[PDB]
Design a protein around this ligand. Structure first.
Ligand SMILES: [Cl-]
Ligand SMILES: [Cl-]
Ligand SMILES: [Cl-]
Ligand SMILES: [Cl-]
Ligand SMILES: [Cl-]
Ligand SMILES: [Mg+2]
Ligand SMILES: [Mg+2]
Ligand SMILES: [Mg+2]
Ligand SMILES: [Mg+2]
Ligand SMILES: [Mg+2]
Ligand SMILES: [Mg+2]
Ligand SMILES: [Mg+2]
Ligand SMILES: [Mg+2]
Ligand SMILES: [Mg+2]
Ligand SMILES: [Mg+2]
Ligand SMILES: [Mg+2]
Ligand SMILES: [Mg+2]
Ligand SMILES: [Mg+2]
Ligand SMILES: [Mg+2]
Ligand SMILES: [Mg+2]
Ligand SMILES: [Mg+2]
Ligand SMILES: [Mg+2]
Ligand SMILES: [Mg+2]
Ligand SMILES: [Mg+2]
Ligand SMILES: [Mg+2]
Ligand SMILES: [Mg+2]
Ligand SMILES: [Mg+2]
Ligand SMILES: [Mg+2]
Ligand SMILES: [Mg+2]
Ligand SMILES: [Mg+2]
Ligand SMILES: [Mg+2]
Ligand SMILES: [Mg+2]
Ligand SMILES: [Mg+2]
Ligand SMILES: [Mg+2]
Ligand SMILES: [Mg+2]
Ligand SMILES: [Mg+2]
Ligand SMILES: [Mg+2]
Ligand SMILES: [Mg+2]
Ligand SMILES: [Zn+2]
Ligand SMILES: [Zn+2]
Lengths: 103, 85, 91, 77, 244
RNA sequence: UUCAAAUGAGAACUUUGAAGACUGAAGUGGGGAAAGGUUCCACGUCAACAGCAGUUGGACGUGGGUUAGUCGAUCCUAAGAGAUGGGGAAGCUCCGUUUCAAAGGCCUGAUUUUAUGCAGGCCACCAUCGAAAGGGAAUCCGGUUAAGAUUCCGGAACCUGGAUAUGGAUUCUUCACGGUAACGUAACUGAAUGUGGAGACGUCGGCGCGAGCCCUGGGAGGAGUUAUCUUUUCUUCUUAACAGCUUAUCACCCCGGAAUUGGUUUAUCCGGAGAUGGGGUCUUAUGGCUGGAAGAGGCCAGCACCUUUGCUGGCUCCGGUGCGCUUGUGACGGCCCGUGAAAAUCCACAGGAAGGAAUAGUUUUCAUGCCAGGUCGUACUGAUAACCGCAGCAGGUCUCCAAGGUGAACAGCCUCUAGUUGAUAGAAUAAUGUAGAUAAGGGAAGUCGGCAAAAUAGAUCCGUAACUUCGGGAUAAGGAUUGGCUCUAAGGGUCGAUCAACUUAGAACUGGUACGGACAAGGGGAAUCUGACUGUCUAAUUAAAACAUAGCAUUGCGAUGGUCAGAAAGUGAUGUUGACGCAAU
RNA sequence: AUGGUGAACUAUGCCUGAAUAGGGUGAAGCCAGAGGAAACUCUGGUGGAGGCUCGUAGCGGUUCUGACGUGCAAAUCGAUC
């Protein structure tokens, strides 16, 4: 039945003032301030989430290796596989069609 | 603790002990969700076990959603009659 | 079972605003909340977003349209007029 | 804050030229289905991390202590 | 008396437009070399809602002729325009819905919208939802074009003025009753502070020319001449006729 | 409120102990924003102040006290504020914020006379101010004071900026390999310029899952009760940031090719634009194990003793349950003529300018190691005594945490933790009052008027008219039942067995016929005037039939324009607007 | 009359935040079944709409023309709403 308090001077329930109740090795309940959850990077064309890309706050991306932030493929980490597949097929067919129009 | 034991035996549950409506005490949607999940869980179990083919399964899937069976026992008996004919 | 005789979707308004005004809203509420065929993918998965915006759940295609219907009667006439005039320019 | 499980790696840490202190902890705990045994933890204090090696074999534990470099400051219990 | 309500609006303190959520000014491309000689192709990337505007807006991206980059324009979407469609703008563009052409490059009877009053002002006429301009004739001498406006008036416009083929999308909006004061509240919340409106006859003489009296009545003719001054122009201004 | 002791010249009021009580988790509890400014703490002290008292105090006198790379400010932009260039004004000054302006500086190459003159190109965005609740790089646990702490101490981490070495990786095919694929990894060159993502977002509804709390079984300790009963009542059994491995609804990939249509949610949606099915990939909210870490903290037992005050021992374990409470989150659904910020900042991709190997180099996006992190705020109250109302005024003043029982319930009523026991007292019980109550028979005869008061009240079952915009009216009206106790039937999970929830219906028995037993809790009906409805106003005598409203109609206007502002202006509002619009009735 | 000071109260717009038990009623959409030559018509469930409704916190201020009326208060207190 222990009751907790904020650990900062902000007394209001804003998005940046979220807390979680945890139990310490001292056997008491104490509030724990938590950061806002991250959002997955989205594809440049269809807008869906990108597979194989870490979900972090924008500033935290500078603290991780390049492996966490890309995929071993053209446009990796920017466009998804299906959108890349559409770009390659569209590029090839249109360029072939331009030749037959020239002659 | 002693009072809770009496309630578990069916005591102190008459019309003179109820202040909320039947919905307030137990929502009807909660009862429906329990029953439909029971019926659907049995149908998947029988189909996986091979006791019922997918064609009879599909018919019974939409009958349970249509309030055809009032409990699990009614569905089992209906399946037996269908397989007996 | 049939729940209402004639109010239909406008039963949320109760007895307010008058029958004639509730009748007019009923005709346009059904149109704007319906599903329409997508001319691109052929499925019945087109529903309104904001007024004049119609997006297909499949194939991610958005089409500008009427306030409460995908195509107004006036817009259909304009297409025929432009098509007829276009055919007289090239040939 | 970091745990190691390879003994060969443990000896390399003890002579990393930045390690000056270490401690040995003895725990009297029980095994899966038998009587309590002796557990020892070897902790190496690095510049930024603390490395812990835990070995549940007392016979193999005594050999590790004798193999520690003499220049390393070792704290007991 | 005191300053009346319609006089206070010109100071623009609490009567300014609420423009936080606006997508941006809806304009055509700046009239450049590509438009006046050939055509340039754009692509509709998305069709979006605009706060305070009944008609939807379309975002069209063009390539910069003189720089390696992309330039985005905000158009008022016409009926039938969809995402992924190619839009052609210029003198030598085809007669299709969504294309932008000079008024002198289309035949009589063509339906157009977002029409320029003068060549280069980037659209002034037929911008509201469901409205359009009808082209009724051409005058190749003096390079003029005669059109019909949504209000019914006839205007003579330069043949170099541009316009978008089709009709503004979102038509039929005003056919639906608002049905409650709450919907009227939310409508003007995104536009400006002009609702609700208090009748002048319900005020005191200090507040309005219609105020006062032991009964609610105007007391004099509500038809006010064009030559009246501020503080007097309340009612029907320069009315040619009244009644049903 | 009461008894006693201690202190004192003096005690209804100070201190301690005992007793009786209250706040009853939307508190009289535990923290803050604004505002106050030392009221905080110790010692000394009672003339004045605390509308009685006073040995006490937010009083008087003298001292002590607020410790940050990680918490805020600082930075960013919001509505908006406001210089410069220019134009107005006799003038104080006014307009305007990218404007009729020659509006500016970081990547280097060139130079070893010296510090940057001087060659290309890049970019034109063109002051600044504006949030202690918006955006935002980074810290936790234990201990410590008379008064300080996420700031001190101990231990354990992390971020930014800057220096650099070693190890590893890569190269003689110079700038890595594996997987059909989704993609995987300890790494595994990339300038200008361009593109994309993150920052970055409404509300309501049910459902799934997580955390804390609540309830509960066994066991190891301590305490209470014990005439009698109770294997009983109460209490302790805890695990932070951070790190490694692992863990997922959704989504995606491969194989395969579907009507005897199948799959599937509480909620009806999906499939030849490739379902079901089999095998895979990924986001790590979240959980599990381990490190941190038992050495801490907690609960006990046995010893020393004016003492600086410790010393030595044990245990700190293993489970269950859910329409529970609070909160976080995921996939969905409803709604709009309403579709629900911006910027700083960080990353990826496209592109290929340059730089690069064989007796040798590059990678500081892999690992380890080295240095630094300024300035200001930080005590306390946060209110029936520290703020504002002339005051220690029953008024006013934003917000977080929230136990058990009864019950639909954050209702009322009782209790645990914690906090108070403060409001001048003693004696007596006339009239008249204020507040709370009860009345024989009659039942509105009272009165301008049923004013006031009374009656009704929960839940289950039965039954329900005129009228109607067909949605309502409706809980219409009008009836019956309700405790306790002993039983019975039905409704489930996992794999015949085994385990676990309160829901409903029914039957005997029982009583001074009582049973929503306190608390809680609609009077109803037949009509007329009037406003359609929800909504709004005379702060401090008028809440209405007044205002507003949707609907209806009329008027002006195509921008060299309508309406309106200004002393003027190279000036403004509507206007980020264009007749399905704006403006005026 | 001349020159100045106020939006810490309050009126209205804008920007950025926060707050709001438990019940009654049961609109669209959806499922099953029944009737009928057809058009179609009924029944049981599901679902959870509304400037709906009972009623807390909150916001407001109808009545007693109650208390007080040199008041606790230059607008408060109690009940009712
Ligand atoms: Cl006015
Ligand atoms: Cl008396
Ligand atoms: Cl009426
Ligand atoms: Cl708000
Ligand atoms: Cl009151
Ligand atoms: Mg902040
Ligand atoms: Mg249900
Ligand atoms: Mg239901
Ligand atoms: Mg008046
Ligand atoms: Mg006048
Ligand atoms: Mg006049
Ligand atoms: Mg009480
Ligand atoms: Mg009490
Ligand atoms: Mg003090
Ligand atoms: Mg005194
Ligand atoms: Mg005295
Ligand atoms: Mg200025
Ligand atoms: Mg600033
Ligand atoms: Mg303190
Ligand atoms: Mg403090
Ligand atoms: Mg003051
Ligand atoms: Mg004052
Ligand atoms: Mg009597
Ligand atoms: Mg009597
Ligand atoms: Mg009488
Ligand atoms: Mg009389
Ligand atoms: Mg009365
Ligand atoms: Mg009214
Ligand atoms: Mg209401
Ligand atoms: Mg008044
Ligand atoms: Mg009044
Ligand atoms: Mg009126
Ligand atoms: Mg403006
Ligand atoms: Mg203000
Ligand atoms: Mg107004
Ligand atoms: Mg109500
Ligand atoms: Mg009175
Ligand atoms: Mg008096
Ligand atoms: Zn994509
Ligand atoms: Zn489609």
């Amino acid at each position: 039945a222990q009751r907790v308090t904020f650990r900062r001077r902000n007394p209001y329930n804003t998005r940046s003032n979220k807390i979680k109740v945890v139990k310490t090795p001292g056997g008491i309940l104490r509030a724990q301030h938590v950061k806002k959850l991250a959002t997955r990077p989205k594809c440049g064309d269809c807008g869906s989430a990108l597979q194989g890309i870490s979900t972090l706050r924008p500033r935290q991306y500078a603290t991780v290796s390049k492996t966490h932030k890309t995929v071993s493929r053209a446009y990796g980490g920017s466009r998804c596989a299906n959108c890349v597949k559409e770009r390659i097929i569209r590029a090839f067919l249109i360029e072939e069609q331009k030749i037959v129009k020239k002659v | 603790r002693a009072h809770a034991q009496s309630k578990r035996e069916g005591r102190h549950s008459g019309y003179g002990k109820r202040k909320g409506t039947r919905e307030a005490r137990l929502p009807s949607q909660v009862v429906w969700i329990r029953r439909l999940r029971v019926l659907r869980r049995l149908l998947a179990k029988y189909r996986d076990a091979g006791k019922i083919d997918k064609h009879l399964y599909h018919v019974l899937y939409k009958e349970s959603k249509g309030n055809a069976f009032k409990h699990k026992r009614a569905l089992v008996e209906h399946i037996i009659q269908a397989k007996a004919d | 079972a049939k729940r209402t005789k004639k109010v239909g979707i406008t039963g949320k308004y109760g007895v307010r605003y008058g029958s004639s005004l509730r009748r007019q809203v009923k005709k346009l509420e059904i149109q704007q909340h319906a599903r329409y065929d997508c001319s691109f993918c052929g499925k019945k998965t087109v529903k309104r977003g904001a007024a004049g915006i119609w997006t297909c759940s499949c194939c991610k295609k958005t089409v500008a349209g009427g306030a409460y219907t995908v195509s107004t009667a006036a817009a259909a006439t304009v297409r025929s007029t432009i098509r007829r005039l276009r055919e007289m320019v090239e040939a | 804050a970091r745990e190691i499980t390879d003994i060969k790696q443990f000896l390399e840490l003890t002579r990393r030229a930045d390690v000056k202190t270490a401690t040995v902890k003895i725990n009297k705990k029980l095994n899966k289905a038998g009587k309590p045994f002796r557990q020892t933890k070897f902790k190496v204090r690095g510049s930024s991390s603390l490395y812990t090696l835990v070995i549940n074999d007392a016979g193999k534990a005594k050999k590790l202590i004798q193999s520690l470099p003499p220049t390393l400051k070792v704290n007991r219990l | 008396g005191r300053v009346i309500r319609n006089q206070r609006k010109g100071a623009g303190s609490i009567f300014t437009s609420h423009t936080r959520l606006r997508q941006g000014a809806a304009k055509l491309r700046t009239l450049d070399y590509a438009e006046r000689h050939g055509y340039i192709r754009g692509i509709v990337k998305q069709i979006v809602h605009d706060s305070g505007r009944g008609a939807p807006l379309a975002k069209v991206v063009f390539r910069d002729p003189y720089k390696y980059r992309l330039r985005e324009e905000i158009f008022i979407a016409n009926e039938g325009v969809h995402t992924g469609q190619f839009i052609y703008a210029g003198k030598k563009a085809s007669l299709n819905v969504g294309n932008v052409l000079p008024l002198g490059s289309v035949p009589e009877g063509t339906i157009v919208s977002n029409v320029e009053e003068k060549p280069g002002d980037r659209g002034a006429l037929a911008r509201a939802s469901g409205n359009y301009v009808i082209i009724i004739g051409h005058n190749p001498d003096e390079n003029k074009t005669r059109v019909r406006l949504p209000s019914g008036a006839k205007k003579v416009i330069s043949s170099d003025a541009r316009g978008v083929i089709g009709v503004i999308a979102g038509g039929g909006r005003v056919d639906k009753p608002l049905l409650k004061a709450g919907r009227a509240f939310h409508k003007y919340r995104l536009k400006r502070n002009s609702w609700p409106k208090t009748r002048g006859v319900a005020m005191n003489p200090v507040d309005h020319p219609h105020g006062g009296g032991n009964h609610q009545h105007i007391g004099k003719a509500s038809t006010i001449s064009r030559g009246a001054v501020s503080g007097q122009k309340a009612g029907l201004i320069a009315a040619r006729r009244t009644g049903l």
